[PDB]
């Protein structure tokens, strides 16, 4: 998705505000060329999109688009790569047209796109081009949401941009339901290794596979395992075949991260109900059973890399070693012999990463420190302690150590002689607060991780997976998720439509061998070519029992359930079913952060902002004017003085807190005096 991206801003391109809003609009020439749905929802909407799927490029920087030219009431079969201009010359009706099995058609009066981008019932003689297919105006990601034609573009685009924010789980199961996109997507995705030549397998490994090309020649394929992504996600590659196997060229050989059985996989397939339960599913609040947690169904791998250099100062050359200034021994335990820590060691935030040291220089010691040294026989060690410690909120083992040395002839930047980079992973369980979302834009944070037992559950004792809130559905216009849920329940269940008395009418034009279904068989629907609700109803009527005589769901997609808390059945049947969902790249830990006191500024006197460092939260204009509205002044004064600029007052207040004593008075602000000096130096009599 990052590739195939379209943007007009840049050098030569317009800047953000300089462009009028109209360029953001969806001109009808966009049809079939730029998917009108996929675009960033921030303050760049309309500024950046992507290509329609079947689109293709002019050598002259245009969109050469295929089209099915019709002739003589008969659609030909000659693809016609057309630009937009010539399109205006012509007459194109829709792919969803009652073609008479031969290019011939059915009715005279046919929809068709006008040179003005307009539609009418053309008499069925006039068109000269038909659509190549449905969904010719879709994006890639847009091509991957079933029932898409049933919900609003708003939540549609929401889920669309989110779906690129999925995070690769460790198990990577495929969804029961989908489209035709999920396989072609991966086969262009690349990261899944593809069979180059048709052949019989030679030998595999967890790291590579020896391949027997059909005539003599052979080859290996190095699996990428635990490769740190650009975002700390793992990049394993597991092989999916056997050394005694034989495959063909251009064939899958090992899934990538989000790939299962070759096709895409962005989550799991889960049974959910929709009731409002205990208020915990309040306003997108999303509840979760412990069962997934203890089953690791939501389990992320993260790869944080740390690096530090070996510079050289006027005081000499930086040093890295177990030799340290004043420091414990146990803290110097899991290091190697020569500074850096040992592979495979558990760690926690603040712990030492690499033992590095440099000279600090010389200053008159305090008499006090000199006294402590004297009573303690402790040397000076003027070389300053400059080691590597893990920053806050970090743990997990260290996989690999990347080490660089100028002495090793490692080419390094100037004023450097040794480089090291470290790799820690932490198998993050799913945890509350994290953001999940179906394939509908329907999203939200993790409400609360509830145990398994305390859960509304089936008559078969099968607990539900999660619960969503009905109240977000209508006002968001997202019935497609309900459609998906019904379909997924049907899919998990399996059916066998009794075509004993001919065929039930809805199944009439339905493709064969859908007349039954093995439970948990995989299926898919084209975006615009999807099942009808009547079709789904006829399906749901056919819902063969799981193990016992077990029609768990009504013909209406609901069922009676039991509160694992109450003990009673609920008073009504309830919508349930299997949904596929994703996990977003907005984990709690990525956002959770607080602070009291840390490293003060250099320009100003101010302890560093930025959650990469500590950072913190800026109390500015909105809730000032606000506090004034409240009338409470002292808190605001304290904030703007003793938490803002009072150099002396900061340590004063810190002292006072340490001693348990009444707060000192707020001193003068610093930036105030700075502005004062500025105004002065502007040749301005000030006083």
């Amino acid at each position: 998705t990052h590739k195939r991206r379209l943007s007009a801003l840049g050098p030569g391109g317009l800047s953000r505000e300089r462009a009028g809003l109209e360029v953001r609009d969806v001109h009808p020439s966009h049809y079939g060329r730029m998917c009108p749905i996929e675009t960033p929802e921030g303050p760049n909407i309309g500024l950046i999109g992507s290509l329609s799927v079947y689109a293709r490029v002019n050598p002259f920087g245009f969109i050469e688009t295929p089209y099915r030219k019709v002739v003589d009431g008969v659609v030909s079969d000659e693809i016609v790569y057309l630009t937009a201009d010539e399109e205006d010359r012509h007459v194109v009706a829709q792919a969803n047209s009652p073609i008479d099995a031969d290019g011939r058609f059915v009715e005279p009066r046919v929809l068709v796109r006008r040179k003005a981008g307009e539609v009418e019932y053309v008499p069925s003689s006039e068109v000269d081009y038909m659509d190549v297919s449905p969904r010719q105006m879709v994006s890639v990601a847009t091509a991957m949401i079933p029932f898409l034609e049933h919900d609003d573009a708003n939540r549609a685009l929401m889920g669309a941009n989110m779906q690129r924010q999925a995070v690769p789980l460790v198990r990577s199961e495929a969804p029961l339901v989908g489209t035709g996109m999920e396989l072609r997507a991966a086969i262009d995705a690349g990261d899944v290794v593809v069979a180059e030549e048709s052949g019989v397998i030679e030998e595999v490994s967890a790291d590579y596979i020896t391949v027997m090309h059909d005539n003599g020649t052979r080859r290996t394929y190095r699996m990428r395992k635990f490769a740190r992504s650009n975002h700390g996600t793992c990049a394993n590659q597991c092989p999916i075949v056997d050394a005694g196997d034989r495959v063909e060229a251009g064939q899958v050989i090992a899934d990538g991260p989000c790939t299962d059985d070759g096709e895409m996989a962005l989550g799991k397939n889960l049974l959910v109900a929709i009731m409002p339960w205990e208020g915990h599913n309040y306003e997108d609040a999303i509840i979760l059973s412990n069962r997934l947690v203890e089953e690791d169904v939501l389990t992320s791998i993260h790869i944080e890399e740390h690096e530090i250099d070996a510079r050289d100062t006027k005081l000499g050359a930086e040093e890295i070693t177990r030799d340290i200034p004043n420091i414990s021994d146990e803290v110097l335990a899991d290091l190697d012999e020569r500074g850096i820590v040992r592979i495979g060691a558990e760690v926690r935030d603040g712990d030492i990463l690499v033992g590095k040291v440099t000279p600090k220089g010389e200053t008159e010691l305090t008499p006090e420190e000199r006294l402590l040294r004297a009573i303690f026989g402790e040397k000076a060690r003027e070389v300053r302690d400059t080691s590597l410690k893990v920053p806050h909120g970090e743990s997990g083992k260290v996989i690999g150590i990347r080490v660089f040395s100028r002495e090793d002839e490692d080419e390094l930047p100037a004023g450097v002689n040794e480089l090291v980079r470290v790799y820690v992973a932490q198998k993050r369980k799913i945890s509350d607060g994290d953001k999940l979302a179906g394939r509908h834009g329907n999203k939200g944070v993790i409400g609360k991780i509830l145990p398994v037992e305390d859960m509304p559950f089936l008559a078969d004792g099968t607990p539900v997976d999660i619960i969503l809130n009905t109240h977000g559905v209508p006002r968001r216009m997202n019935i497609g998720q309900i459609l998906e849920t019904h379909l997924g329940w049907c899919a998990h269940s399996g059916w066998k439509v009794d075509a004993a008395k001919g065929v039930p009418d809805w199944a009439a034009r339905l493709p064969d061998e859908l007349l039954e279904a093995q439970p948990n068989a995989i299926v898919s629907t084209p975006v615009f070519d999807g099942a009808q609700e009547a079709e789904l109803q006829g399906l749901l009527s056919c819902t063969l029992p799981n193990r016992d005589g077990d029609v768990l769901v009504d013909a209406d997609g609901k069922a009676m359930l039991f509160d694992g808390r109450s003990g009673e059945p609920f008073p009504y049947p309830v919508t349930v079913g299997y949904m596929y969902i994703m996990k977003l790249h907005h984990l709690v830990d990525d956002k959770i952060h607080a602070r009291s006191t840390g490293p003060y500024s250099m320009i100003t006197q101010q302890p560093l902002g930025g959650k990469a460092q500590f950072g913190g939260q800026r109390f500015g204009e909105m809730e000032c004017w606000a506090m004034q509205a409240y009338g409470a002044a002292y808190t605001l004064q304290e904030l703007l003085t003793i938490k803002s600029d009072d150099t002396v007052g900061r340590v004063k207040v810190y002292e006072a807190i340490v001693k348990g004593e009444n707060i000192p008075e707020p001193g003068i602000p610093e930036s105030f005096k700075v502005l004062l000096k500025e105004l002065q130096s502007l040749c301005l009599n000030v006083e």
């Binding site: 693809i79 086969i187 069979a195 064939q251 339905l510 070519d529």
Partner: peptide
């Protein structure tokens, strides 16, 4: 179809498209 390791997913195609997908990275 038309793919060697294609796991069998049945779909609801009521139509039939002449052309298949292009080479997305050809761009």
């Amino acid at each position: 179809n038309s793919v060697p390791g294609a796991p069998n997913r049945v779909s609801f195609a009521k139509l039939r498209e002449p052309l298949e997908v292009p080479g997305l990275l050809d761009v």
